[PDB]
């Protein structure tokens, strides 16, 4: 009858950078989503492959909680079938995703006068990520035929960049905290049930 540790993921003081997105495995617990939708700093919740109305009455092998910060107008990329810098190069959901995406404006926490540069994203990559692939390499990106040998220069770019959130940003450029809940149904005993 132990409730799942949802708060540990939603109430964190600092979130992960999206390219380095954090995963927490959740299992052997009772999933009370009301501790989540009564959170107050709880703003949006959209599920795929399952209805929220059915969640209290389903069981899953595991629940993974992936968390990171992106900017507001990038949240639409955290969805099946999307493209763009985040879905292509930073965090990719499968087309047949089963789970829920939770997001809220974190301008009061994650922006700073003069800019918060702690949150990073991958800007350059040669190919799209597979679903749930994580790439944390910092290799100098070779944009032409000349090898970089670790040296930054023309056609040789550091692959990451900072958001630099400022409180005066328009809402599309403000930080959003995101938690992705993946509901795993393997051929195994179910350890996460919500009653």
């Amino acid at each position, epitope marked *: 009858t132990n409730l799942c540790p949802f708060g540990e993921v939603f109430n964190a003081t600092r979130f992960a950078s999206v390219y380095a997105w954090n995963r927490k495995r959740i299992s052997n617990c009772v999933a009370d989503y009301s501790v989540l939708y009564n959170s107050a700093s709880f703003s949006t919740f959209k599920c795929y492959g399952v209805s929220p109305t059915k969640l209290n009455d389903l069981c899953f092998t595991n629940v993974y909680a992936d968390s990171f910060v992106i900017r507001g*107008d990038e949240v639409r990329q955290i969805a099946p079938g999307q*493209t*763009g*810098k985040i879905a*292509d*190069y930073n965090y990719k959901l499968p087309d047949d995703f089963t789970g829920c995406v939770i997001a809220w404006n974190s301008n009061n926490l994650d922006s700073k006068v003069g*800019g918060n540069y702690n949150y990073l994203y991958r*800007l*350059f*990559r*040669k*190919s*799209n990520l597979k679903p749930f692939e994580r790439d944390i390499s910092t290799e100098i*990106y*070779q*944009a*032409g*035929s000349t090898p970089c040998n670790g040296v930054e220069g*023309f*056609n040789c*770019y550091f692959p990451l*960049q900072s*958001y*630099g*959130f*400022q409180p*005066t*940003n*328009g*809402v*599309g*450029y403000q930080p959003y905290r995101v938690v992705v809940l993946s509901f795993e149904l393997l051929h195994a005993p179910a350890t996460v049930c919500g009653p």
Partner: antibody
Amino acid sequence: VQLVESGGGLVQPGESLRLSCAASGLTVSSNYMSWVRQAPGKGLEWVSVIYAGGSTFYADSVKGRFTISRDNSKNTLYLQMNSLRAEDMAIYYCARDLSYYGMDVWGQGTTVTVSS
Amino acid sequence: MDIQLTQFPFSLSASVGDRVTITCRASQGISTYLAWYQQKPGRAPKLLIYAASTLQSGVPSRFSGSGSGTEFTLTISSLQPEDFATYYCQLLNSYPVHFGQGTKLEIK
């Protein structure tokens, strides 16, 4: 480092045209590659981009009529333009986009004239 | 909504050696996501400034960019004869790529 556009010319409204952009000194398939156009006497207008990973995006004014593509073995970018209209009359520039660092490399563009 | 960028002055006359400042205004806060381009008639634009204040490599040091949020400026310390051109600002890090509609800098 060179970007060299070709394929511009005179068209009637409703006809189609394919532009090419041949690159030397950067790898088209490894970059954000954009087309940006400029109508006679007007400002710059972004048209389309293709990501290194293959995603494509389009200005609303060309969605459904323009298709961007590339050929890695030729190191060449393309813009297929269908159902051309008066408002597509412009010089079309090919550009390498570094997205945070701006568009640092441009060709000198190819002219599309739509007969009145 | 979409960001819109607006440039002023629309046209400006100035003399060789003058100091000129031109501005770009964003319809909402865009941090430092602004680039400046110089364009001679019929030529490709040339990148001058990215991230609102970082000089592109090889650009003369009389060009400088300033600003954050919604108000951005491009300053030329001491105008040279080759500096007369139309200048454009561009929203960075977004593919619905948005441009200003230009400031035309003419000789006085």
